Amino acid sequence: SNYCNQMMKSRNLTKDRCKPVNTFVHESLADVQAVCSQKNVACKNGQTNCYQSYSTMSITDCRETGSSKYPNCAYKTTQANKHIIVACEGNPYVPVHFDASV
Amino acid sequence: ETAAAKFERQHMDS
Numbered sequence: 001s002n003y004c005n006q007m008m009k010s011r012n013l014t015k016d017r018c019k020p021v022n023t024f025v026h027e028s029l030a031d032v033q034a035v036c037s038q039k040n041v042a043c044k045n046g047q048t049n050c051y052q053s054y055s056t057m058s059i060t061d062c063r064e065t066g067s068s069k070y071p072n073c074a075y076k077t078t079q080a081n082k083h084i085i086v087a088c089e090g091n092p093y094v095p096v097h098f099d100a101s102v
Numbered sequence: 103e104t105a106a107a108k109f110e111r112q113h114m115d116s
Contacts, residue, residue: 024115096105098113
C-alpha cells in the first residue's frame with residue numbers, strides 16, 4: 001500500500017532526496033517515550049544511552065524501491081510487531097535517535 | 103529543530 005509514499009512525504013523525508021530507509025511507530029507518544037526507562041543497552045555507535053522496549057511495538061518499515069528515484073520517491077511498506085531501540089537524551093528524558101528494531 | 107522534535111517527525115505515527 002501507499003502508506004510509506006505518503007508518510008515519507010508529509011514528514012518531509014523526501015524533500016531534497018529520498019531517504020532510503022525509515023521506520024515509523026504506531027504507538028502512543030507516552031509508550032514510545034517510556035522505552036527510555038526500559039532495558040538499557042549499547043547504541044550501535046558505542047554510547048550507552050540506548051534502550052530496548054520490553055514489548056514489541058506496531059511499526060512500519062519504509063524502504064525505497066530499487067527502482068525509486070527523486071523527486072518521485074517510492075517505498076515498499078512493510079508492517080511489523082517488533083522491539084525498538086532508541087537513544088534517549090535530555091530532560092524530559094526522551095528519544096532523540098531511532099537505533100534499531102528487533 | 104530539536105533532536106526530540108526530529109525524532110517525532112521522523113518516527114512518530116500515533
